[PDB]
Amino acid sequence: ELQPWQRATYDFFMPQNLREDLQKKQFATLQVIPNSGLPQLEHWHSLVPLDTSSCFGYPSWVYKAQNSRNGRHYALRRLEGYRLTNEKAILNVMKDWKKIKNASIVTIHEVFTTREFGDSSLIFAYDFHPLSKTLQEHHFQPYRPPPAVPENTIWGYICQIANALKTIHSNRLAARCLEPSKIILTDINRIRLSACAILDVVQFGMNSRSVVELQQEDFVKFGKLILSLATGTLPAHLNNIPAALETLGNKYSANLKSAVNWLLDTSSGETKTIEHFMTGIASQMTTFFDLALQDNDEKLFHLAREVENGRIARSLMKLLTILERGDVPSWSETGDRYQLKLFRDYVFHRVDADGKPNLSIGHMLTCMSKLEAGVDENILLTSRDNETVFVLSYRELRQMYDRAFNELVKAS
Amino acid sequence: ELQPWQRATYDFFMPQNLREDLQKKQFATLQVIPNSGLPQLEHWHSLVPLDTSNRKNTSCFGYPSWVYKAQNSRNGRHYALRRLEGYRLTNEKAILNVMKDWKKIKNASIVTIHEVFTTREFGDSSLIFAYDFHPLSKTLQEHHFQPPAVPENTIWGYICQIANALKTIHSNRLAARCLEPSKIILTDINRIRLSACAILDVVQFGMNSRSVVELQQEDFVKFGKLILSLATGTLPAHLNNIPAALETLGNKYSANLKSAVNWLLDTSSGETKTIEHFMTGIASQMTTFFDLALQDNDEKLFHLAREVENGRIARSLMKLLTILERGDRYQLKLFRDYVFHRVDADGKPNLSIGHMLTCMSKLEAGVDENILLTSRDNETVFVLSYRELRQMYDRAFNELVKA
Amino acid sequence: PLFSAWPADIISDVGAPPLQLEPSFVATLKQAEWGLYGKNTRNVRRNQVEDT
Ligand SMILES: Nc1ncnc2c1ncn2[C@@H]1O[C@H](COP(=O)(O)OP(=O)(O)OP(=O)(O)O)[C@@H](O)[C@H]1O
Ligand SMILES: Nc1ncnc2c1ncn2[C@@H]1O[C@H](COP(=O)(O)OP(=O)(O)OP(=O)(O)O)[C@@H](O)[C@H]1O
Ligand SMILES: [Mg+2]
Ligand SMILES: [Mg+2]
């Protein structure tokens, strides 16, 4: 119902949905409990529980916490009743996984034991991702049955996981946990492995399998995860792999069936490598490279507009500081400042032909932007009396505006 | 040697200085020229030339070409206008058919084409192509050939983005016809976009008889030559001896790069080359650059979250400016004086931004905390809460709204 | 009601070209090193919305 040249007030600002998502996540990050019984660890405080209600060998809790050195928020995963018996279990694993930096893996910053919860506990410190939900929560939570995962979403998942496995396997490690419950949606279609270091520590020195063997099992788990998502059945419920594969074959492309089958197939004589798997999904990967860049551009668009809102804001403050001071005498009403007052009237005190005041936010933002830029465009400022008129460029105005402000700075 | 791409640092798409970059690009978008000779077109105004040097060069299109930043009057947005000077369109079907194909195309590695139109408004026959505007873009030619070794990673990054463009173009039964360094623009750090896509399709519309598949095979060769030019620092026209250039590349870079470039150059294999086959061969690199794109996504989101309140702060300051001094009101004037006209004990002005933000924040919220507004001469004084103040300002504003 | 809240249904124009003045009129103005000033002859309300 709006002409292409005309904008509603809020079109000049960040769209409501994005604004609300950011605000909610800001709120989730800043949430605290002033007097919980929960302890402060030496470098961690303001612990906040996240558990609404498996992969590890211990009962586990997750807390949002704030680091005392840098003031940032991290997610602390606690394993209850873990006893330190070999420090290498903690130290070697921490050394290895601290190297790992990957967009599809929740970063591990620290692994440490503590008695501060009143038991022996093992703590893993992670990047905090506000308002995250697991793939299990998102796809398998009943009521009504959960809807069919679109094939495109699945290839998006496959590519992000392949990205994780590429980095994990190259560092001679294995992503050991690939359950829906230990993969988190940190944003729309954006998934991250969230429990990576943990299995390495708990099974340290008890596991007899080689690195390569654990890596082979990663592919099988990868396949079962996709199979769970395709057919809507929990991994625990996946009793019949072939029956699940056929369901997938009916609902999805042959290309997907082939990918899942390669991942499940332990019968070939061939050592499976993430390199070979990537080779088989190059086209999908290219598509998602493109979409990532497009999403970058979208975020950059909004970022550029809000940074400019900030610059405008600081400029409006400078304006208010300069105009109508109680004051040399009359400094505000004389010389450079006089034009600035007339400029303010031009920007903010517009009126229709009918004399009705005009409140178009678009005019105000643009004018302040042009002033900041010192544009070579002329405008017509009229005296309050209405007898006299002045024609100035924004460039000229900026010179005046800067001079007026620098005078105040000098006065110090 | 998978190592060069495996090594690439995580900041590959992240700007060195985001603050300065945004500010420069903001200024570039609003720039105009006080006395250009340039015309206003029916839907276009504020034309600004972007060509650094005013020299007639016709290399890719066969005609002199200019690029203008311009502002569309239909929607208020800025576009980049490619003008072919002295070009007369002889078949109108050329624009309609070509645009039907290319308007579908939306790709991170291709500058979107929106419109093609003829005009006499420059004082000649001219053909105009309207593109997305990318402020402060520079061509690969300007950037790599303007009087050191391009790192292999930068090259793989370029290769992945160009492959991304070619995937979309070839899938839509089209051909990127121009793959010259001068027609690929860096719109951001290590970020390239094909900038001349629609043009050859239009200019040669009747004349070119080669098939779609034939023009695509040529994409690969041109692609190969671009990489070869960058690797060895010699412009594509000077690339007289390809085998000699290939050995040079083989000495400075990995066997994988030599192999990829060789596949792109090879017309002898008897095999129809496909972008699907090429992507398959660079899958590892593509995954790395997918990761790097996503990490930049996280970086941008971080800054976005930090800047989210700026609109709210700006609108508040605007209402203050909208209400005051048009020609209760006295308290309002005193509040503005309290916030922005602070003075030191010595009578000198105080410019602490912190005071202004805290005050505007408390006003915004309508906090109950009480403040003391006094005229500088102490005769009159008021003790009010911010809650009371917001009530007052809003009433004034609602009066203004009524109209 | 937050103070930052502005009315949603207000419309702005964004496409318009910059103000072009009649050359006759510009002659009326008396040049200064920072710009031009003169007597308002036009029948436009002060700071009125201009349709370019
Ligand atoms: N790194 C993280 N940042 C933010 N939130 C996280 C992070 N890791 C996990 N969480 C959140 O903690 C919550 C609990 O996760 P957890 O995996 O412990 O429970 P679960 O998967 O429901 O358990 P179960 O496997 O028994 O069903 C989830 O909603 C998840 O989004
Ligand atoms: N979509 C765009 N947005 C912003 N700037 C662009 C866009 N496309 C091209 N430019 C810029 O316009 C300038 C001129 O580009 P153009 O390719 O026309 O000339 P050139 O490459 O310098 O010389 P030649 O025309 O001989 O190739 C370049 O600096 C380029 O970065
Ligand atoms: Mg839990
Ligand atoms: Mg040019």
Numbering used by the authors:
A (entry chain B): 207 to 259, 265 to 353, 359 to 543, 547 to 631
B (entry chain A): 207 to 353, 363 to 542, 555 to 630
C (entry chain E): 355 to 406
From the paper:
Two conserved complexes carry out the majority of deadenylation in the cytoplasm: Pan2–Pan3 and Ccr4–Not. As illustrated in Fig1A, Pan3 contains a zinc finger at its N-terminus, a pseudokinase domain (PK), a coiled coil and a highly conserved C-terminal domain (CTD) (Brown et al, 1996; Christie et al, 2013; Wolf & Passmore, 2014). Pan2 contains three functional domains: an N-terminal WD40 domain, an inactive ubiquitin C-terminal hydrolase (UCH) domain and a C-terminal exonuclease (Fig1A) (Boeck et al, 1996; Wolf & Passmore, 2014). In conclusion, through combined biochemical and structural approaches, we have shown that Pan3 is required to couple RNA binding to the Pan2 exonuclease activity.
The best diffracting crystals were obtained with a construct that lacks the first 27 residues of the PID region, ctPan2343–458, had P21 symmetry and diffracted to 2.6 Å resolution with two copies of the complex in the asymmetric unit. Molecular replacement using the structure of ctPan3 PKC showed clear difference density corresponding to a single ctPan2 chain (comprising residues 355–406) on each ctPan3 dimer. The overall structure of the ctPan3 dimer in the complex closely resembled that obtained for ctPan3 alone (Cα RMSD 0.94 Å), although there was a slight (˜6°) rotation of the C-terminal domain relative to the coiled-coil and pseudokinase domain (Fig5C and D and Supplementary Fig S6C). The major difference between free and Pan2-associated ctPan3 was a substantial rotation of the N-terminus of chain B (residues 207–224) by approximately 90° toward the Pan3 CTD (Fig5C and D). The PID of ctPan2 exploits the asymmetry of the ctPan3 dimer by wrapping around it at the interface between the pseudokinase and C-terminal domain (Fig6). In particular, ctPan2 Phe357 and Trp360 are inserted into a pocket of ctPan3 formed by the C-terminal domain of chain A and the coiled coil (Fig6C). The PID of ctPan2 next passes over the coiled coil and interacts with the N-terminus of ctPan3 chain B (Gln212–Ala214) through an intermolecular antiparallel β-sheet (Fig6E). This new β-sheet is located between the pseudokinase domain of chain A and the CTD of chain B. The PID continues around Pan3 to form extensive interactions with the CTD of chain B that include an extended 4-strand antiparallel β-sheet between a β-hairpin of the ctPan2-PID (residues 384–393) and a β-hairpin ‘ear’ in ctPan3 (residues 597–612) (Fig6A). Finally, residues 399–403 of the PID of ctPan2 bind in a highly conserved groove formed by residues 599–603 and 562–573 in the CTD of chain B of the Pan3 dimer (Fig6D). Collectively, the interface between the PID of ctPan2 and the ctPan3 PKC dimer buries a surface area of approximately 2,230 Å2, and the ctPan3 PKC dimer interface buries approximately 3,740 Å2.
